[PDB]
Write a protein that binds this ligand. Structure first.
Ligand SMILES: CC(=O)N[C@H]1[C@H]([C@H](O)[C@H](O)CO)O[C@@](O)(C(=O)O)C[C@@H]1O
Ligand SMILES: [Cl-]
Ligand SMILES: [Cl-]
Length: 449
């Protein structure tokens, strides 16, 4: 205790804050300017997942040597159309002679009446030539496409008297007749999972309008397709320096869940979908229908740029996948780590910028139990141990520290490194829909009660 740092937990979001009855799914990221960003599900109708819940994106900022600022809703869809599970990423690009910083946020989006349990398949788009067009359905399940200037075309390629604005509002004869995201609209969007993206150029003050990442990225055979909540990373070393890496997961036609990442090499302008660790020489994540499912995940980078994907799964212990091509593919051996008991809950893992006992290190946090209790933060030392049959080296984890930071209820959490080398933790567990945040140092993790 004598030399340890640990702040008493504070509530950043709670029932009633921003008029919301519920809050869930914490995400935490630090900017290059030292600002801490805390995004959350603004679950206005209660703690339940989609569907039947008006969920929005909220965020709070804490600049270096400053207080937590007021929370703001930065993405809000009509009715009970949900924006659920957010992920944050601070990333930079060498501009003219200025290294400029942009903050990325991706979130899963459902139209009204839909969520993970009842999602349909498809991207929500139809491809004509090389252009993807937003699909709309009438009550008779006929198909329409939104094209130039928002004009709605029918299945025969002829124009209707409908226009859809970018916020999915439907105009007919100069009158607003509905919104494509609502259960009561004459023309509805496909009831399927989207990943939407927003970005901020001013250290998190203001955010762009959502950009749908589905077209050309989500496979038509996918049903669920959504953000793995927490954070993404920008690769710092190796062949793929600068690549943005965002953990996601999806389901195929058998509703089997598979983890993956989407990545960008043009600073978020375009995105590509990498393989799942489910995808091997033997197994295809498109057609698999049995075995261990891999769902929510987080990614950390090795000293040479090698990627490690930590995955929530239907097994007892955390699964870790290894990528040699910046997340495009994963080594076909995906082992457990018997030091990371995994009771089917989201986890957090991050890179640590400084050496710990002369080694590069990562930090891990999850409920270390057979249920969502005993929130524990672990420190992993990185050790080389030979190379692969290929040329790339082999990294292993030494879990030296394993500190309980929440003996009672503990669910979703997200770590981040503070500008001073300390650690922040945005976690569920304090009860009554309260989203808690605490700070501590490495000595707090070394202490063994
Ligand atoms: C999009 C969505 O629904 N995400 C939710 C996930 C998924 O439902 C599961 O990963 C699917 O198996 O699970 C939670 O319910 C949970 O267990 O805390 C909360 C989270 O918001
Ligand atoms: Cl302890
Ligand atoms: Cl509760």
């Amino acid at each position: 205790m004598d030399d340890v740092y640990k702040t008493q937990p504070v509530e950043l979001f709670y029932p009633g804050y921003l008029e919301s009855r519920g809050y869930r799914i914490p995400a935490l990221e630090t900017t290059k300017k030292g600002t801490v960003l805390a995004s959350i599900d603004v679950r206005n109708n209660g703690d339940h997942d989609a569907p039947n819940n008006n969920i929005d994106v909220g965020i709070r900022r804490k600049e270096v040597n400053g207080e937590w600022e007021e929370g703001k809703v930065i993405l809000d869809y009509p009715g009970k159309s949900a924006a659920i599970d957010t992920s944050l990423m601070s990333a930079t690009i060498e501009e003219n002679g200025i290294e400029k910083e942009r903050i990325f946020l991706i979130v899963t989006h459902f139209p009204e009446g839909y969520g993970f349990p009842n999602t349909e398949g498809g991207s929500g788009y139809k491809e004509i030539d090389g252009k993807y067009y937003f699909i709309l359905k009438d009550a008779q399940n006929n198909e329409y496409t939104v094209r130039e200037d928002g004009i709605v075309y029918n299945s025969e390629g002829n124009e209707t008297d409908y226009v859809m604005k970018n916020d999915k509002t439907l105009i007919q004869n100069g009158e607003e007749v509905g919104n494509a995201l609502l259960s009561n609209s004459p023309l509805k969007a496909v009831g399927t999972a989207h990943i939407e993206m927003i970005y901020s150029d001013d250290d998190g003050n203001t955010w762009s309008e959502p950009e749908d990442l589905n077209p050309g990225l989500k496979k038509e055979w996918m049903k669920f397709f959504g953000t793995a909540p927490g954070k993404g990373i920008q690769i710092k070393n190796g062949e793929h320096k600068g690549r943005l890496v965002f953990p996601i997961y999806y389901t195929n036609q058998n509703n089997f869940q598979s983890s993956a990442v989407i990545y960008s090499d043009d600073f978020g302008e375009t995105w590509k979908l990498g393989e799942s660790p489910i995808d091997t020489a033997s197994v295809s994540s498109e057609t698999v229908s049995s075995g261990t499912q891999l769902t929510e995940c987080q990614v950390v980078e090795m000293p040479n740029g090698q990627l490690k994907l930590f995955m929530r799964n239907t097994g007892s212990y955390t699964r870790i996948a290894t990528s040699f091509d910046g997340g495009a593919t994963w080594h076909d051996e995906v082992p457990e780590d018997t030091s990371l008991r995994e009771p089917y809950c989201q986890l957090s893992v991050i890179n640590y910028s400084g050496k710990i006992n002369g080694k590069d290190a990562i930090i891990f946090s999850n409920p270390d139990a057979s249920s969502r209790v005993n929130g524990s933060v672990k420190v992993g030392l990185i050790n080389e141990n030979g190379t692969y049959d290929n040329g790339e080296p082999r990294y292993e984890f030494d879990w030296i520290y394993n500190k309980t930071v929440k003996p009672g209820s503990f669910a979703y959490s997200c770590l981040t490194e503070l500008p001073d080398g300390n650690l922040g933790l945005f976690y569920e567990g304090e009860g009554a829909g309260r989203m808690a945040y605490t700070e501590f140092d490495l000595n707090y993790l070394k202490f063994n009660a």
